[PDB]
Symmetry: D2
Subunit: 116 residues, 4 copies
C-alpha cells in the first residue's frame, strides 16, 4: 500500500540505505510518527504499513537526503526532502512515492493505483 | 538575494500568482515567518528580503502548489512543495529556488551564486 | 538487460501503452532498428533483448510521447523523447531507462547495475 | 525568439560553456545545421536566430552534455541531450528550452510565449 523508491542521479543507481520517516497529521495539528525504514539494495522501502493501518489522512514522507550525500563525501543543498499529501482516499489506493536525487536538486512523483 | 521562480509543466508557461511563504527556523525549533509573496506574470518573486535582513540560518520555502492547481480546476496530489536549506553559512550568497510543477510531481533546484565574482 | 519505465506526471499513473523504439548506431552513422514494444499496465517494457544480442554500441531509445498525450486529448510540445547512450562499453551491465512525462516537459534517468 | 538555458544540478550553478547545436529537418529527412553557440556565464544562449530566419519546421536542439561533464572529470551516461519539436506551426512564438543536468539524468522543459499577447 505505501512504497518509497529513491534514485541517485549522479551515480545512476538506486539510493541505498536512505532513511525515510513517515508521519500522519493528528487532530492537534502536530505530526505523529507513523512508519519508518531504510531503503533496500534496490532503493525501495516496502511493508511500511497495511491496508487497514493506512487510513484516511494527511501524510508526510520525509527522506534524509542530507545524510545520504554526506556519507558519500558530498555537501548537499537541502536538509531533506519532504512530501506531504492526502491519502484522502488511501485504503482503497496503492501509493508509490518516487524521488530522484542530486546534491542541489530533487524531484518527486507519485504513482497512485487502484486494486480495481 | 532570494528569488523564487515557478514553472508550469502542463501548460508550458510560468506559474503565475502562486503563493510563496518563507520561514526561518528559530532557536526554539519552530518556524518563524520571514517573507511572503505571489509569483509575477513571469513566474518570479523578487524583493522578498535584503542582504542585511537575510541572515545565516535554516530557511523553509513553501510553495502553495495545491491552490495553483485547484484554481485551474485540477485536483493535485501534494499539499504543497517545500524546500528546506541552510543559507549564508559561509557568507552572503544570492539564492534562486526554481520549481517545476505538475499535478502529481514536482522538481526543485537551487542556483547559488557569489556576488563576489 | 534493458528495461524501459514510463510515468505520467499529470495523472500520477504509469504511462500505459506508450510506443518505444530502440535503435543501434551502425558504422554508416545511421540508426538501425534493434527492438521495439509498448509499455505494459505498469508502464514497463521488458524482454526487449538478451545479454548476447545486446552488444557494445551507442543506443537510442525513442519514446512516442506525442501520441500518448494526443490520445488523452492533449497537445504536447515534443515530437518524442529520445535517450542516446553508450552501452556495455566496459562489459555487460543491466540498464533501466526511466522517463517521467508532462505535456511540456520530460525528464529521464538511467539506473545502471552490474550483475 | 529562441533561447536555451542550462543548469547544473550537482554544483547548483548555471552550466557554463556548454555547446548547443540547433538543426532544422530538411525535405530529405536529414538534419540541416541552423544555429549554434556556447552557453554564457549565466548558462544562457541568446541571439541564435531572428523572427524572420526562424521559420516553421521541426527543430532539433542538441546539447553537448557529455563534453561538459568530461571537462569536470566526470564520466556521464548520455552522449548528449536532444530536444525535438515543431515550431511556429500556428504562427510566430518565442521559445525557451531549459535543461537541468546530472551525470546520469536530465530533464527538459519548454516555455512557449506569444508576442501577440
Ligand atoms: O520569456 C519569458 C516569458 C514570459 C511569459 C509571461 C507570461 C506568459 O503568459 C507567458 C510567458 C520571460 C519574460 C520576462 C522574464 C522572464 C521570462
Ligand atoms: O520519479 C521517478 C520515478 C521512477 C521510478 C522507477 C521505478 C519504479 O518502480 C517506480 C518509479 C523519476 C523517473 C525518471 C526521472 C525522474 C523521476
Ligand atoms: O530561475 C532560473 C535561473 C536563475 C539564475 C539566477 C542567477 C544565475 O546566475 C543563473 C540563473 C530559471 C530560468 C528559466 C527557467 C528555469 C529556471
Amino acid at each position: 500500500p505505501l512504497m518509497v523508491k529513491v534514485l541517485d542521479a549522479v551515480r545512476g543507481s538506486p539510493a541505498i540505505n536512505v532513511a525515510v520517516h513517515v508521519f500522519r497529521k493528528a487532530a492537534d495539528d502536530t505530526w505523529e510518527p507513523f512508519a519508518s525504514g531504510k531503503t533496500s539494495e534496490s532503493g525501495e522501502l516496502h511493508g511500511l504499513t497495511t491496508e487497514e493501518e493506512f487510513v484516511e489522512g494527511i501524510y508526510k514522507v520525509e527522506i534524509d537526503t542530507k545524510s545520504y550525500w554526506k556519507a558519500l563525501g558530498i555537501s548537499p543543498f537541502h536538509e531533506h526532502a519532504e512530501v506531504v499529501f492526502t491519502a484522502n482516499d488511501s485504503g482503497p489506493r496503492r501509493y508509490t512515492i518516487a524521488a530522484l536525487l542530486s546534491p542541489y536538486s530533487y524531484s518527486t512523483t507519485a504513482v497512485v493505483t487502484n486494486p480495481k
